[PDB]
Amino acid sequence: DTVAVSGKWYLKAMTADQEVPEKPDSVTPMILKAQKGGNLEAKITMLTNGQCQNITVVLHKTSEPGKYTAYEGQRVVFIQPSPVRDHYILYSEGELHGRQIRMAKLLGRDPEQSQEALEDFREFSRAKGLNQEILELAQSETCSP
């Protein structure tokens, strides 16, 4: 499952059960690198407030396909295929910077926007009790490494 989601993605949309102050102006592609040993390394760059912010998150494999842990075990991340092909949905729960926050993210192989994938993501998000507005992200190679 790890190898299946590896490679280049576009982070299309995200939502949470809390405020999430830092809304980036744009993001570079999300790179999911499958590592020897089964873990995933997620890398993305954000343009926020006139500066380039590189983010690296190591996702640790569990016995459940698609289920990973993060941030020294204080966070769980579920990765599963969307009903629309070449899209994936992330859902995470637990601690993040010392607070309990739950998030969902929509990933797409291609930059083209899929209305069906977004609609399914909205439904998924509601079914997880993520009822804030859906935040759709701007794609750009600005700040790319």
Side-chain angles (χ1 to χ4, degrees), residues 77-79 81-84 86-94:
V77 181
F78 300 89
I79 306 180
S82 167
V84 184
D86 306 297
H87 294 70
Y88 268 74
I89 48 174
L90 266 51
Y91 171 72
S92 53
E93 306 177 317

Side-chain angles (χ1 to χ4, degrees), residues 24-28 45-52 142-143:
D25 296 330
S26 64
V27 294
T28 67
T45 301
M46 293 179 189
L47 176 65
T48 177
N49 289 318
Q51 53 187 318
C52 305
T142 296
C143 290

Side-chain angles (χ1 to χ4, degrees), residues 118 120-121 123-131 134-136:
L118 195 65
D120 295 356
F121 181 65
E123 285 186 14
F124 172 89
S125 289
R126 184 191 41 195
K128 299 298 186 190
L130 308 176
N131 302 326
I134 187 182
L135 204 140
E136 291 172 38

